[PDB]
Amino acid sequence: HMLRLSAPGQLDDDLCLLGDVQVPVFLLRLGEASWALVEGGISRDAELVWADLCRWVADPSQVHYWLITHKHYDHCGLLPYLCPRLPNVQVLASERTCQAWKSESAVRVVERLNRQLLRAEQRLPEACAWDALPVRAVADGEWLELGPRHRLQVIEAHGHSDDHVVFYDVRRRRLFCGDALGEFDEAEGVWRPLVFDDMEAYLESLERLQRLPTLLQLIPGHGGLLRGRLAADGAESAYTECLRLCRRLLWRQSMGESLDELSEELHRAWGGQSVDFLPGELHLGSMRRMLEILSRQALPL
């Protein structure tokens, strides 16, 4: 399709997609000798992403910034493995995201989930300690002056997770929105909600993002770059699809169903797209946790 760029390589004059479209790392050319990465992927893609990077960046000491939307295993798993190869990089993440990398228990979950995605006999590169990453915490509303023609604003966008932020390039009307709009359904052209922490926060974030100046390019955590009406309408549509799922959950619960029936239907209808980076039972469990969250906020009793 023409409204979705979903191939590795060059996406715009300044922008390349590294790695797998399903868990991409984005490469921004900031100047003649300066680059940034956006999104932090899964650990097992370290050598894939590195090889792709080296196709575009002759000297990786020119990679100066690495922007991170949130702490989930599939958005920061590359950091320990590529940061030793990027001597001048500064990781830019929210305060809460940074705190996750200081917690043994949080780091433990991230490593376990990423380890489950290793192909057999696959070994990972030498790693920076999670608590020694070259991180700089960024605040809600902070302007990131990455280069002469790259200025991106940090926007808090909690709900999917309690630490989640997005990055807005107003010059290009380009939003790196992470998972705050959900998972874009490639077969059907709609957003699938990913409400894994707080429903009211998730919806309130979408309300705020809808108020941004009209988007030309919308870049979530998975699936590539969206443009035209998909970008312009994305935040509003994601909001609408979340309400649709809430109503659906209430309809079925009013028929006496347990959360497990719609959980299984959601896993059936939606689990295929992420199967290669969501190990084992995590998708079905993610659907369950989402419906639990929605049920607590929206159930009448």
Ligand X SMILES: Nc1ccccc1C(=O)CC(=O)O
The residues of the shown chain that bind ligand X, judged by CB under 6 A, are 72, 74-75, 179, 183, 194, 196, 221-222, 274, 278, 283, 286
Closest residue to ligand X in the complex (CB) = 72
Minimum distance between the CB of residue 63 and Fe ion, rounded to whole angstroms? 22
For the residues of 68-132, what is the DSSP string, one character each?
Answer: ----SHHHHTTHHHHGGG-TT-EEEEEHHHHHHTT-HHHHHHHHHHHHTTSPTT--PPP---GGG
Closest residue to Fe ion in the complex (CB) = 72
Minimum distance between the CB of residue 132 and Fe ion, rounded to whole angstroms? 24
The continuous run of DSSP H or E covering 269 comes out as: helix 259-270
CB closer to ligand X out of 269 and 298: 269
* Subset of 218-257 contacting Fe ion (CB under 5 A): 221
CB closer to ligand X out of 45 and 179: 179
Residue 72 binds Fe ion, judged by CB under 5 A: yes
CB closer to ligand X out of 80 and 279: 279
The whole-angstrom separation of Cα 262 and Cα 181 is 21
Say if residue 179 carries a ligand binding annotation: yes
Q: Where are the beta strands (DSSP E) in the chain?
A: 4-5, 9-12, 15-18, 25-31, 34-38, 63-67, 90-94, 135-138, 143-147, 150-156, 165-169, 174-178, 183-184, 191-192, 217-220, 225-227
Say if residue 283 carries a ligand binding annotation: no
Residue 211: how many other CB atoms lie within 10 Å: 7
CB closer to ligand X out of 30 and 224: 224
283 binds, among Fe ion, ligand X, none (CB under 5 to 8 A by kind): ligand X
As annotated, the binding site includes 70, 72, 74-75, 160, 179, 222
Q: Which chain residues interact with Fe ion by CB under 5 A?
A: 72, 74, 179, 221
